[PDB]
Structures are given as structure tokens and as C-alpha cells.
Design a protein around this ligand. Sequence first.
Ligand SMILES: Cc1cc(/C=C/C#N)cc(C)c1N1CC(=O)Nc2cnc(Nc3ccc(C#N)cc3)nc21
Lengths: 550, 401
Amino acid sequence: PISPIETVPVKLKPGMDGPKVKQWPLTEEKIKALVEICTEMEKEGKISKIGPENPYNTPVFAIKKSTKWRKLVDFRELNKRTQDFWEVQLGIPHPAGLKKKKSVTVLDVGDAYFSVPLDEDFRKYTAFTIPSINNETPGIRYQYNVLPQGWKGSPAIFQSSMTKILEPFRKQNPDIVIYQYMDDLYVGSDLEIGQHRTKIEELRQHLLRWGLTTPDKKHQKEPPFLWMGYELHPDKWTVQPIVLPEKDSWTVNDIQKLVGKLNWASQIYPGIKVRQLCKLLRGTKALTEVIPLTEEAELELAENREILKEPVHGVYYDPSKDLIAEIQKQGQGQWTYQIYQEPFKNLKTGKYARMRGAHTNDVKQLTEAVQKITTESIVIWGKTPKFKLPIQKETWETWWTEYWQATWIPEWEFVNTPPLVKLWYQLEKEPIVGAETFYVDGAANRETKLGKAGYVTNRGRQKVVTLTDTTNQKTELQAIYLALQDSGLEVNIVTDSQYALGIIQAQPDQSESELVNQIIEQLIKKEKVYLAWVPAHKGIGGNEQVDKLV
Amino acid sequence: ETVPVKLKPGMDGPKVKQWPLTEEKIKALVEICTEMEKEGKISKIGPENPYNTPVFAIKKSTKWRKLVDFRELNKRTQDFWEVQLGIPHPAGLKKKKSVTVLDVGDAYFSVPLDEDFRKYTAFTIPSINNETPGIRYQYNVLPQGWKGSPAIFQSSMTKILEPFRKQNPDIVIYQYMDDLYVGSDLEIGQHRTKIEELRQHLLRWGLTYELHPDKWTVQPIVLPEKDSWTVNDIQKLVGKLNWASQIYPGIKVRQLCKLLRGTKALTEVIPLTEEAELELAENREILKEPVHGVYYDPSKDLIAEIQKQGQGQWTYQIYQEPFKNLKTGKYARTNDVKQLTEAVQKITTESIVIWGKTPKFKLPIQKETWETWWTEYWQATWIPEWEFVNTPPLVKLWYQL
Ligand SMILES: Cc1cc(/C=C/C#N)cc(C)c1N1CC(=O)Nc2cnc(Nc3ccc(C#N)cc3)nc21
């Protein structure tokens, strides 16, 4: 049937006319197949022959799907000339946001697109031509009256058509849930299996009255449903079975597919790690090339196989209870988390491992992870969780009151699950009396890429090392590193590098720079470090005379 | 009869993603928009409308209010509301003793919107966990938040205020988006009385907060006065002066520099030569005075930079060319994001009053933090443009008091 639903008006893009692609001549067998396929569609109202007036055309082909034939219309040029539509849906419901359901059935709309009418004023643009044998005769010329398969507006117009049809039934049955995905309807309720398969029949009847056929009770599926990679049960959910291939040799392509399934398992299996497996994909190799697994990559693979040994399931969402989110750091900038309402029945898990910056510390990373769990919460549940974080209330305040960027993480509580988050050093707020003062300076010749780094102190020491393949930024950090090697456990350091001051004041505990990591190692051993910035080239004390040397 | 609106030539409509909303704000929006729809102000739309602008709910008063982010649509119709039907900005407003801000956005819900323009005002109420398709609407009336609305309603607004202007020629009334700014030099009781009169004029047409711009003085760069002076105190002084050199023509620092000559310990006390303390004095003079030669250019955009100082204190500068500061300030006095959100609204308001423009903000915050949270403290009906920056480490030090 074609349903009696009002049509959605459709326009070509402005300044453009409908397509006029020419029909390639087809084989006598495809022409015969197309004529059969077209006669039956024309009978049911899906298509209509048109006179020669219509000046538009789209190529049509036919391919052997067995012994049966499929009609393939190639809407590539009409699609390019059709207006844009609002898009079909902006996200997929995550299982962890679904509520518990006593009875669930999946309905499948038959011949979805061909059961919805096409805007009468737009049909002309869908004209196609079945060519004559060795292309002698004028062909037979049709146009669509329903949504064509493969045209740009089909998915959008179908799913809004389906939405206006369901909206009555939804109002008169507020506690029945129905999710539209392409030509599936997923239907859920808390009714008993008797009263539930009643209202499904009342729904099917309401769909038939709108020209939409469905399967009989014989074809409605039963839990556990496989869906979007998940395995939904009435009271729980998991990811569909994740199998880890035991191979002697791993290709790039094998490792990419393994990282994908581990990433996907990380939604409900806590503690999955992929860092060491992803390090192997760094670089440029063909998909077919074999990658030997490093020692750390094999230890990560082993620990993952351990996590996945027996199945884990998630529970669904009770709207009447708070969400708790816990974060643990796994090391190396890897974070993992669990969201539950009753400890410890997880609605879901995840991981965070972003290099946000070249240099950061665990406190900045923990905040970043809280921010991404918070956004995710809003999406899935419409509500932020209460956090349990492995950082002391006083470490956090100390950091965020001193730091120059603003922050605001929601209600949280400390939880003693080591490794705890700490700052590993802190710069003095005022110069250290009785400590040597180093006036450091770096310089690099942009032509040469050569550089000198050095210091001079108030005690009369002095030193200048030379550097190759370097930059002003690198020499200025080399200078600070020099002063920290040669200094004792207290030291004042005067630099004209706002670059270096910027980095070091943010208390990084990890960096992509081998240098910055060596400077950090040095800053932790010290007991006291004051670091000040003085304008370069203003003849300022020791700065002009360490500027000489470099 | 609707005023026809065009976008800029060769520009399409806004296609801006909807930020996720909490359950409480989605429910507030759904109530508001069923009542707007039944009153005819908006209509459901179908998939053939590909446009979108974001919506939020603000509770700015105990009642939820819908806030539509038309920043993108405003950029795309900027010839209409600025060069074709612009509202002139009075230079007298910033001189008045008292300025009262009144919301007159309900005025626009009586005027119809050009039906060939309505599709560009599309918006989406999202749903939690994407379990239902978004509810989609477009406007049939002039919407709040679009700069096209005050430009179209201009004529009407001048008929409404014409009796009140004639009877009070020394009161300045300036419209900016959904607000009237009303300035007088009256004593505050008489000022409030004249505001009450004006509300009565507006109530006969369906349109049912006190600044003192006269007292918005500069936040000068301030130099310390000290008992002693270590070398570290002098180095920080030279750095702070040398950077101030780049805005204030006249700053001198080569008499303070001589004192720092060798390689001395940071904590060593250095007596100020009689030479030097004239130059602190002279630069002190300089820094308590506006910039010579910095003038507002009406064709260029306004920029606002904000630095977090700690202890609930924040500094800001407004400029069009970096270091040519048109205005500097502080904002004082909980929560970093609540405070910053308040500072952004204060700076925007002053900026509307002074130039009739809102600035683009350089915000010292992570984007996702800001976008999660700004909604819960935002009380204005407009939204300035912003981007996210990392505050240079010492710019914060040089604007401290
Ligand atoms: C998104 C979805 C997918 C399927 C997929 C089936 C396939 N393949 C079935 C339903 C009913 C929904 N929907 C629609 C909606 O709009 N809201 C829902 C709220 N809560 C649940 N919970 C829930 C609990 C257990 C089971 C099982 N077993 C299924 C769903 N489902 C909802």
C-alpha cells in the first residue's frame, strides 16, 4: 500500500534544474528484467509511465541479486541537485540510558520507502527510461510516485512520515515506548505479556490503517535481541560477543580491528587498555604488513584477554536514583571510569586518554576526564553524576585557586583508590634567601640551527654548552636544565623565556619533550626552586652578561 | 504586512548543532513551546527544513525562559539589521547618572515575520538519550534574540516612545536587541518615577536593573610603593613597566635598570638612587591617565580579554587593536564559572552602553567546561561571541592590583 499521509514538499537546490543523464543501452536480459520489475511496480501505484514531455532522466540498471533481478536506479545526479534535509537522527540511544522493560517486541515495516508518497510536484524529476533493444525505439518512461530507494530525501521523509503516524498511538499510550530506526519499530512496555501483545495488535492495526504492513505474531523477535552491536536483555545489556584472535602474526589490519573491538568492549568491561597496541600503529605501513608485538603490547594483550574471560553485563537506568561516577588512573595518561547507581552494578564504563596539550599534569587530566564524563551523562541521562575521585579535596583547591584558567567540576568526594592524584613539586612564591641565583639564557641561530645555552650566577660560576639542530625554544629550556643540574637543593633561576616560564609554572608532570621530562625529574629532587622572568635585552643584571656568552 | 528580509548574498541559513540539555531544561522548553505554538508564535516543521539554531533555558525571578542562540543567524543577516535599518547609538547615554535596563522583548511577538524567512529560524528541542526525534519548530513572529527584530520594530518603538520623549527631552532611550536603556541625570527617586511612567506607556501596547555609567572609572596599572627594594622587586618592577611601555607612550625604565647591573642575589636589598625614584614618580603620573591616541573605530570589532586573578577577582581589557585599550576594569566577587559568567555579562552591558556593540570575548577556560555550565548562571537575553584562550602567564601579573 501507499499510505494516505500528506506529502512533504521538496525543492531542487536554487539555480539548479532536474537531472538529464542519458540511459546507457542495456542487455536484452536486463531490459527484460526491468520491464517485468516495472510492470508490477506500476500496478501497485509505485510508478507511472509518462509521455515524452518530461525532459528529465536518471540512468537505471539491473543486476542479478540467485536468479532474481534487482532494479538499480542511479540517483547520483538528482541527489546532487536536491535540497538538503534535516538529518535523520542526531544520536543512537545508548543501552545504559534505557529503562528496564518487562515486554519487548520488534516490528519491521515492509517496503518502507515505497509505501510513502512523493510530493506530486517533485515526481517529474525522478523520470527514468527502460531502453529499447540495441536502442532502436524510444524506451518506456516512468516516474516515481513514492519515495525512491537511493534518493537523498527518502530516509528523512520516511522517518518523519513514520513519526506523524505514530504520534496518535503514542499520546493514547504514554507508557509504551517505541523507537524508530529506518524500517524497524522497537516496542517496549511494562505490561504483562498478555496485555502487551494486545496493544501491539492495536498498534499493528493502527499502522495498517495508514498503509503500513508489519510481520504477524509469528515473526516478532524475542530477547535476547542483538542490536547495534549490543545484546539487550529485559533486565540487563552487554556488548555482543568479543572474540580475540590468537595469531602467530599480526598485520596492521589485524591490529586496527582488535583496537576497535577492545574500544567497543570498553563500554561495559572495566579496565580495557589499548595504549600499547595503538603505539604499534604509529607510523606508515601497509594494511597487509606484519607488526611484531612489543613486550608491553603483549602484556597489554594478555591483561585484556584476562578481563574478557567471563562475561560482564550492565544494568539499566533507574530515573529515581542518583548517578555515581568513579575514575581511576591506570598510568601513562590512561584513565578509566565506571557509572553506577547501586555499588557496584555498572550502567556503563569507559576510558579517557587524551593528550590535551603538549605538557600537563594529572590534576589537569583528571578535570578533563570529569568534563567528558559529565557531557556524556547529560546526553545519556540528562543529569550530571556525583563524582568519586582519587584526589584529596586540598590538592584540588591548592591547584585550581592558584591556576590561571577557570574551572568548575560538579559535586565530588575523595575516594582512596591509589594511585592518588598529586602535584609532584611546587615553585616558591618568593626568592630563596641563602640560595644561589642563576641567570640563565639560551640562544639559537635560525640560519645555522646552532645554539648555546648557559648561565652565570651571583656566586661567580658560569657555563656555556653548545647545541646542534636546535631552536630558541629548545636552548631556553636547555639553559634552565643546566642551572638545575649544577644547583643544590635550593635555587633561584632568572630567565627571559616567557615560553619556559609558562610551561614550568603550570607544574607539568608529563610531557612529549624529552627535555621537559628531564627538567621535571630535576624539579622533583629539589627542595626549593624560585623561578622569575626578566625582560630580555634591557641590560638587566646577570641577564645581559649571560646574554653575552650566548 | 511583513517586512521582507534577505540573508547576505551567497550565504545560506544557519546549521548549528544543538548542545545537549539536562532533563529539567528539556521539560521547561517543552512547556514553553507548546504554549507558544498554541498561541501561534511558532509552528512545527518537517524534514525539508535543514536549518537549525540552538536553544537553552535560563531561569534568570523563579520562572524558566527560552533563550535562542541566534549568533549565527545574526552574522548572516548583518546587512539587514546594521546597514539597511540600523538603530543609531547615542553618545550621551554613557554620561548619564543612572541607566535603567528594561526587557521589551514581548513586543516582537505581535509582529509577523516574513514567511519566506521563517525557515531560517528553525530550532530543535533534543531528547534525553536520543530516544525520541527532536521536536522541531520555526518562528512565525519576530523572535527574541535576532537582531532583525529591533530593526523591524524600530518604527513602532518610536511611535510608542514619542509622547514620553517629547515630555522628557533630557532622558535618553536606546534600544539594543530585546532591551531599552533609559538614562537620566535625575535624582534616583525621580529617575525611578520616570521609569514607572515609561512602563505605563509601554503597558498600553503590550510590553508588561540600575547602572551608573558616570562612575565606571579606569583600572590603572598600579605600581608598588615599598619600604626597601630587593633586586627581585626591581626586576618585577622593570618587567611590569617595560610591558606598560607598549600601551603608554612615555614610560621610562633605564634609571631603574642601572641599579641592577651585576649578577646579584635575588634577595639583596638595593637602595634606590635619587635618579630612579623620580622615574617611578613620573611613570606613576603616566599610568593614572588615559591612553593618548586610542579612539573607538566603529567599523572594527571589539575584543574583551579576561584574566583570573584569584580570590574572586578578575581583570579585563576592551580593545580593537592589541594594547590600544579603550577600557580596562576589574570585577570582584564561590565558583570560577559562575564568576566568569557574571563578568562576561557585566562587560557586555557596559559595552552596549558605551559603544552599542558587544565585544568578542577571549575566555580563560576549557571550551567544554564553559559550554556545560554557562547556561546555569546566564541571565541576559543576548549572547556575545567568544573564543577560548590560554592566558599568557605574566599578562595576569601586570594587570593585578
Ligand atoms: C532503543 C530501543 C531499542 C530496542 C531494540 C531491540 C532490538 N533489537 C528496543 C526498545 C524497546 C528500545 N527503546 C525505545 C525507546 O524509545 N525507549 C526505550 C526505553 N527503554 C528501553 N529498554 C529496554 C530494555 C530491555 C530491552 C530488551 N531486551 C529492550 C529495551 N528501550 C527503549
